[PDB]
Design a protein around this ligand. Sequence first.
Ligand SMILES: Nc1ncnc2c1ncn2[C@@H]1O[C@H](COP(=O)(O)OP(=O)(O)NP(=O)(O)O)[C@@H](O)[C@H]1O
Ligand SMILES: [Mg+2]
Length: 614
Amino acid sequence: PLGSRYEDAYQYQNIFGPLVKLEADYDKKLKESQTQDNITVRWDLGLNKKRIAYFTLPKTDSDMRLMQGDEICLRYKGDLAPLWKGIGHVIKVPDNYGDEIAIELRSSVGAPVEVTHNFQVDFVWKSTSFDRMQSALKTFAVDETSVSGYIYHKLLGHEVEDVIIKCQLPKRFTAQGLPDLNHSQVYAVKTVLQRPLSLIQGPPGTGKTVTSATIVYHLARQGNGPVLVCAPSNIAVDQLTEKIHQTGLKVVRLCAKSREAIDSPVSFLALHNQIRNMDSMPELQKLQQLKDESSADEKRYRALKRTAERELLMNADVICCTCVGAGDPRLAKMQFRSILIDESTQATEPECMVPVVLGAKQLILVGDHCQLGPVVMCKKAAKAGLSQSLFERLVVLGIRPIRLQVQYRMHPALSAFPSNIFYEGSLQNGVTAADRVKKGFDFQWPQPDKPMFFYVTQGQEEIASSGTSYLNRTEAANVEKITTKLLKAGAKPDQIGIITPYEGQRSYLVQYMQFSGSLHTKLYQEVEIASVDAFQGREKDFIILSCVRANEHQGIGFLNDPRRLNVALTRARYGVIIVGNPKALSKQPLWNHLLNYYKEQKVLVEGPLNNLRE
Ligand SMILES: Nc1ncnc2c1ncn2[C@@H]1O[C@H](COP(=O)(O)OP(=O)(O)NP(=O)(O)O)[C@@H](O)[C@H]1O
Ligand SMILES: [Mg+2]
């Protein structure tokens, strides 16, 4: 793809720097060309004494997904002129609680509360993440202690005499609150602790994230400073934060300042939440109550929060953050001896380099290049080398990943197809059918010993009322019938996921399951519905795919990307149900194999209380 060898870090910066600038300009253009205007706001001083405007935008399934934290710029327009400008940040996006975007605006005064149409939602571009990428390339080139010198040479592809990191290993490598390790995982931990640089590779469910949590536990039990743990996406970092919390380490989850409205299983571990509960600093406590219920108290509250952050950050055992989030100014002046990056194959190399240059002497990279890769909008940058992850470049350089092969997530039948198509049948099972026979679940499949079937459903795929996305109302109905059948059978709502490629299908499934659901509306609200991105590195007991397209033209998500389908088929533990049109999905070498294998196992069925289909 691109020459993996480099003379020095100056030359490295000169290659990657322009690539990053190419990506920064491209999606600056794209963001500023995504303006809506015919929208109607919904003003109200939200119960936390801060103005929170609501609005609905046309359903568009893009790759630049509007996330919680993005800066948005309102604009009152039309004939009736308190015409002004107002800036805020996204406190909520389309989800299970209705498909309405909320923002929490900074200032609350000049904004007219005349809830009146003809506004203009502009997506404010931030160079933040690209600035951090460029800054990290500069630190690699200029800062002598950015990396250990061994790692400096190994990252540039130089020939280096091997170094053995000396340390007192533990007697036993399994960590307390995590699963008992394999021989392969025990080997991975033992080997990793004594190498300055290591890659860990492995198919879905093979304990990469658990093994990473275990490694971070032992690195923390050394006398060093805080271990830095990263992943490219917020979802993957939450997965890792949770496993590390289970070992009993003092964890701090750093996130961007605007993403404090997020709620995950370990949201309480976040820095902004830990600071609210500072029992050692009652005075920022007094000021925090003040902002809820001035100008001088603002600069004092600001510096008081800066002090509390420094205290928890410098005194933590582990700091979990996004790769890009490692370049956060609050982590400036800090250095990290040990650094691990889960899901490293999902990041571009400059993004992945943001944490690395903060003093790395021991570096662990965990990945799977058959799962989600980097997202590069600009095709020119991608072709010029930005699409290759750090992990993958080191593999070309000859470092051999420690490999995990035994999965413990899925049922043998579920892992059968993904292994043969994506991993050459080299993904095997450390769990059997007896282990994945859901306890307290009276449901019988169209073929026992095989918790899976492709439900056939031809239907009118149409466009979304507002937007460019697609949906399939006939399938949606069938997906609620499957969801209702699983819930009555014993399955808990929070252990069912529904993956679908399109935004129009997601939005429709949320409203339709709640309104027209047989059971309580609160139960369908508890069932997650999203694209594969939402389930990155995660697992549910049951998954339901909803392939929307019943037409001729290309798809987008798991319809035409091998990476995304693999991830879609490897989230389930106890069973998976795919819903879609066999004919429409057939025009795709990957999906035509799926339909063949399912027909051979006598699970290509149709019509409630079902039987085989041709
Ligand atoms: N040695 C083990 N023994 C028993 N169960 C295990 C073991 N390792 C992992 N598991 C199970 O697998 C789950 C953790 O899988 P995980 O560490 O997230 O795999 P992963 O490689 O990160 N999957 P992915 O992120 O999709 O590539 C846990 O719920 C465990 O029950
Ligand atoms: Mg994972």
